[PDB]
Write an enzyme that holds these catalytic residues in place. Structure first.
Site: not given
Lengths: 29, 19, 258
Positions: C43, C99, C205
């Site tokens: 992402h 992911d 992230s």
């Protein structure tokens, strides 16, 4: 592969421990 | 949800040749 | 990272910063797994709800860093990307299942005291170590507080932060969220009753969740910072991409592409 992966130049390779890694090893019961 | 969002730009300029 | 501490110099030599060329901004963390391959969350590169879709020409990886904002002359290395590989079944529509993304660097980086790859788990390391109550370590330059990240020096750190967090049992993870969780995810954090706190947060992230094997002393990357609802909220946990469960795809890409 990665023959030398995961051994840090300034810690494992010199036999020095960082400041909190014992907390990790102490949890592996 | 997913983890930048509020990204300002207070970064030192990197060397020209990387842009 | 919320309620972490400053990392030591050389403490996470595999930590990578994903950096946007224009505007120059930090996008995500990432990790070095060989001289030419970086692992991150998909992402960080593609998330259509936020109109995010980066091509390799938009990005730079900066390796060997400690300070968030300084260009660390003679220490960090900056590389351009040759190709990006998103998992074909990354599910951005519903729950960020699978992911994971690989990024191939244009040229090999040379290793040094500040730049060294992390290991990827094998079935037996994942089996012995991915157990509830066992702690892993998360690192990143993200926000220090849920409400406060923006830049400057609000809730944004001067140097790399680190926090150690326990893996949580799958029941407790499932019952803390309405999001459908899968076998490709695990969650970590302290329970409300444990007294200690800590979490990843916005800007972390794509970063590594790593564990140190007690059998051979090496560091293994078990997770990738993927999602969470808030940062460090009681009764909520951070979720991580399960790297061993997607290791066959990783091997396939590196074997097929260099």
């Amino acid at each position: 592969g990665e023959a030398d992966c995961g051994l840090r130049p300034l810690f494992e390779k010199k036999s020095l421990e960082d400041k909190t890694e014992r907390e990790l090893l102490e949890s592996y019961i | 949800x997913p983890x930048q969002s509020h990204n300002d730009g207070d970064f030192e300029e990197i060397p020209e040749e990387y842009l | 990272i919320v309620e972490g501490s400053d990392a030591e110099i050389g403490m996470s030599p595999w930590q990578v910063m994903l950096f946007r060329k224009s505007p120059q901004e930090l996008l995500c963390g990432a990790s070095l797994i060989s001289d030419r391959w970086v692992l991150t969350a998909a992402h960080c590169l593609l998330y259509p709800p936020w109109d995010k879709n980066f091509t390799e020409n938009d990005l730079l990886v900066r390796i060997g860093k400690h300070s968030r904002t300084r260009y660390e002359r003679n220490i960090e290395k900056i590389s351009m990307l040759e190709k990006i590989y998103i998992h074909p079944r990354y599910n951005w529509r519903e729950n960020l299942d699978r992911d994971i993304a690989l990024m191939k660097l244009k040229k090999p980086v040379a290793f040094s005291d500040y730049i060294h790859p992390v290991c990827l788990p094998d079935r037996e390391t994942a089996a012995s170590l991915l157990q509830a109550g066992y702690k892993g370590r998360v690192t990143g330059w993200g926000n220090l507080k849920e409400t406060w990240t923006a830049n400057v020096g609000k809730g944004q750190p001067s140097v790399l932060q680190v926090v150690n967090l326990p893996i949580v049992e799958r029941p407790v993870c499932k019952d803390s969220t309405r999001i459908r969780i899968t076998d490709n995810m695990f969650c970590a954090g302290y329970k409300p009753d444990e007294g200690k706190r800590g979490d990843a947060c916005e800007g972390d992230s794509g970063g590594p969740f790593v564990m140190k094997s007690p059998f051979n002393n090496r560091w293994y990357q078990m997770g990738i910072v993927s999602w969470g609802e808030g940062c460090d909220r009681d009764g909520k946990y951070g979720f991580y991409t399960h790297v061993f469960r997607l290791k066959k795809w990783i091997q396939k890409v590196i074997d097929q592409f260099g």
